[PDB]
Design brief:
Four copies of one chain form a homotetramer. With about 300 residues, chain A is an alpha/beta fold. Chain A folds into two domains: about 130 residues, Rossmann fold, CATH 3.40.50; about 160 residues, L-2-Hydroxyisocaproate Dehydrogenase, Chain A, domain 2 (Alpha-Beta Complex), CATH 3.90.110.10. Chain A is about 45% helix and about 20% strand. In chain A, the strands form four sheets. The first copy, chain A, has a six-stranded parallel sheet with strand order 3-2-1-4-5-6, sandwiched between helices. A three-stranded antiparallel sheet of chain A has the order 7-10-11, with helices on one face. Chain A has a three-stranded antiparallel sheet with strand order 12-13-14. In chain A, strand 1, helix 1 and strand 2 form a beta-alpha-beta unit. In chain A, helix 1 runs parallel beside helix 2. The longest helix of chain A has 18 residues. The first copy, chain A, is globular and about 50 Å long. Chains in contact: A-B, A-C, A-D, B-C, B-D, C-D. At the A-D interface, strand 10 and strand 12 of A face strand 10 and strand 12 of D. Chain A: It catalyses: (S)-lactate + NAD(+) = pyruvate + NADH + H(+); (S)-malate + NAD(+) = oxaloacetate + NADH + H(+). Chain A: Belongs to the LDH/MDH superfamily. MDH type 3 family. Belongs to the LDH/MDH superfamily. LDH family. Chain A: It comes from Geobacillus stearothermophilus (Bacillus stearothermophilus).
Chain lengths: ~300, ~300, ~300, ~300
């Protein structure tokens, strides 16, 4: 019998709630929205509010809020949005992963939780899943901001701007501006150095730019979207080329780390890590980024 | 030259924000999200966050946050979600918002959410000087949305094949016609026993409070935002939908000078027509009771 | 392993091609367009053209033309659109028997390569052709459906929308039975925003709308000069495909096998159904007036007449 | 009052009809499908069939078929798919001269009823035919556009995607100039997820892909047997219509009028453009290599040779 995909979203804060609504809207599957029992009634309210929107927006999807992981049973994909001082989010990543793993042993996992490289590593180790089934989000969000900033600079559709991002957020980000185009035209040909360097730099600070404006909590629209593109690529077996936080076993000359790298995202999750020839400057830039990744993994208990 | 539609959403709370995002995602036009000066930076941050989603979700829409009504200039539609003596308080906000809105957008259609929507839409109507077709309240679409959700759960069918029919406002002011409510065209009274169907009707009456009580802070925002977006799309794309709307009556149902939840044609001229149904004597008594409460709330205005 | 739904479309004429293109556009799954060996090249050419559109319209769906039914293997759904239109001089019997032989040959190949698929039939006359596919397939009755009532309600809704100047989205039609003289419409279960149409459209004009629905297929035939409708038939197939693949549990009229519903058994008939992950989840049985019962009896009489032309 | 955009499609062959159907489906505005008085009934049949699909696919749009250009009055956009394929006995010159007359006759009617529309031309040879529509209309250059590069990039991306086994959404092609030998593809400006295709595909198979792109139109002709591509050509036209109606400011390749760009004047040429609410907002000039400059000059000589065939 034909049955809908089941997707569970852990964390019913703004990113989690938004991701649940975007998945249901696209009819990608039934959605279970999970958070802690103290937040049970807010979570139920959000999900039911979302379900009450379905006759109007015209999507068929079930949406339930819960504090019981039993309801996540046989999820095809789980999206981890929980957490808030790295050990804080490590222990949450461990308690969550254990519960997710029991009810859906065959599930794929996407981790938003900061810092993503280390939090996705924890979820990988604790799960005992193969490496293709545990992905973190980072590069798509940085790519999204960079594309927004270049589209504003050139006054062109964001559809025709591409960014290229290895590594994580802020100072850990390794952008290849030489693999960044407008309609396939290298951006170094279109935007003078000061303004381009200023866009790379707004991309680094992009997460903080939103926190500072809000005054409380962090970004949620663009992060939720980023998670949803990654989920869609798996559920619809799209074999997208997307930057993902993936477990390395020799690629770029590193091993036993999660790093932000170009991947093929398909029905098996990470189909493959793509290995690029970097310039000496990019190699140097990435080596620095990885040292920062090792620096956080050693912060783990 | 081909120009995008412009929509301003007043109120950058959860309903306002969710409405702006849904409008952009549908490529219905450029979106200006407005609130008070004290909240300007939070408004810009929500708007920028939404726009930064656009490369991933793959829509071309401009989203900007502001506290300056000049950024709302030449809006095709404005959605009022601003608000929280509830009547007396919100009346003040509606007069002040509407005076800025019409200054900058003299030819716009206005859709009002703010409760109580019957008295707040009346206040926007009188303050604006606009003809009745251009000043619209949201109520019944949201009530019908909950009703259909509940009926879809009850029968285990697509929400797409469930119809509700709702005159008047929320809760006890709601005048449902279950004889005009269907699953795949089949009267629900044929498919759901009376005890469960009255429970669904009562659940619809209370539906707004049910979310408020679960959230603990604030009210529903997803289904309200969707409800608003369905009405915006009907006007912007000139669809001539039959939808329940809070519309100004000049004779219809034997009432005049009030806004009331009634079935409407919604198109490019706004409310094209208020539809007049033959009501049974019970349904006329229910609607009179509902109108009594509307007049009651209008007698708290100044 | 998350894997894509697979849909085979049998028949590469205008309705088949349009159905493949719509299924792919909606990313409902990978599409295999199938026709006879003699048309292998035109079938591959239409499929490659559709595929070449996918980057521009922005959908991930694979579309291939073929005449090798091995390429249909593990299809979740198969849409049969193959069959003959009548010519001047052709007996009623010969039209039925020719199309019956196609249905048998196609079904044998389908069930071999996709023994677990759902099958949706368009081929005229759809009651006797869906019956034929059913018997040949050995499938349980929930997995073999015909299309008829969706297309009739689509024309009905188009005419009503034009009469009232409102969105087709807020108009509903309700039809039992097949096309033309065999259609059994229920105007009393037909609405505009939930308002009974008999309260909104005067009897002469509403009666004319029903009649235009009856002749709806003929009207497109006479305008085109050669062949029949394809856009609205194609869309009608897609809505039924989507109901199943996305387990929507839609209420939709379908050509369903009856074992007692409405007082009939051993036949396919247009009836209201719930369409979902298990195909026909339920044939819905309504309280019919005495006139509607008599019109459905005369419609079943035509179904049984055509079933008696089967070899 | 909010009023729908209005698009007229000239020619009710497979590309035109498919274009009309895709436009309606996207709710981009009301569609008027136009052909000659002789095909009025068939044009009306196709338009009615498409409109009767709209309740099922859930789109509100008016679609009419006509032979009366008065029904095109006040179009925001007009798409020209009309024109003749080469008859036996006909030279290239005769094919040019014949379609030139159709462009002129069509354009006269279009501008009489839609003095402010944007015009997009499919008709081959598109460089010389867009030029004809430009000069007959008396419109500014931003308002008259041909389609070519989008279709070639669609075929290219399809071939690259099947080579690398990845989403067509993550492949880009970059083509200057027209179809066949006139095509000037920049493989160095062609990527997968931003990665140059030269670093992912071996030269021999990349060369075969560039060659398959040149022959792409003919591969479809040869498979079909009796007509050319329609699905990818219609989709290409629709992406360009959408960029103008939704003022998207896409970077898309288009047949555009040059006054000095790449050193060329007084010709339409396949070039990268910004396409938005003003039509061609800008022709983008690239810094080309000496080989690329030489290839474009050869392609431009092909464009000038055809332009000399015009009367």
């Amino acid at each position: 019998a034909m049955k809908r995909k089941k997707i569970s979203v852990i964390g019913a804060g703004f990113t989690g709630a938004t991701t649940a609504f975007l998945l249901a809207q696209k009819e990608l599957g039934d959605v279970v929205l999970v958070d802690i029992p103290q937040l049970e009634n807010p979570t139920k309210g959000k999900a039911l509010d979302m379900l009450e929107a379905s006759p109007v927006l015209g999507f068929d999807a079930n949406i339930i809020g819960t504090s019981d992981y039993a309801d996540t049973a046989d999820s095809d994909i789980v999206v981890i949005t929980a957490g808030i001082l790295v050990t804080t989010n490590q222990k949450i990543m461990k308690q969550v992963t254990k519960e997710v793993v029991k009810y859906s042993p065959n599930c794929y996992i996407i981790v938003l939780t900061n810092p993503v490289d280390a939090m996705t590593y924890t979820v990988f180790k604790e799960s005992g899943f193969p490496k293709n089934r545990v992905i973190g989000q980072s590069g798509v969000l940085d790519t999204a901001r960079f594309r927004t900033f270049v589209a504003e600079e050139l006054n062109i559709s964001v559809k025709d701007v591409t960014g290229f991002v290895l590594g994580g957020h802020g100072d850990d980000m390794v952008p290849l501006v030489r693999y960044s185009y407008a309609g396939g035209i290298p951006l170094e040909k279109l935007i003078p150095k000061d303004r381009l360097d200023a866009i790379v730099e707004r991309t680094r600070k992009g997460g903080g730019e939103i926190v500072n404006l809000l005054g409380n909590g962090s970004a949620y629209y663009a992060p939720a979207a980023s998670l949803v593109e990654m989920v869609e690529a798996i559920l619809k077996d799209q074999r997208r080329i997307l930057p993902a936080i993936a477990y390395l076993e020799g690629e770029y000359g590193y091993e036993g780390i999660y790093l932000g790298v170009p991947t093929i995202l398909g029905g098996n999750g990470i189909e493959k890590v793509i290995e690029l020839e970097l310039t000496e400057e990019e190699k140097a830039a990435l080596a620095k980024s990885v040292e920062s990744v090792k620096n956080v993994m050693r912060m783990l208990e």
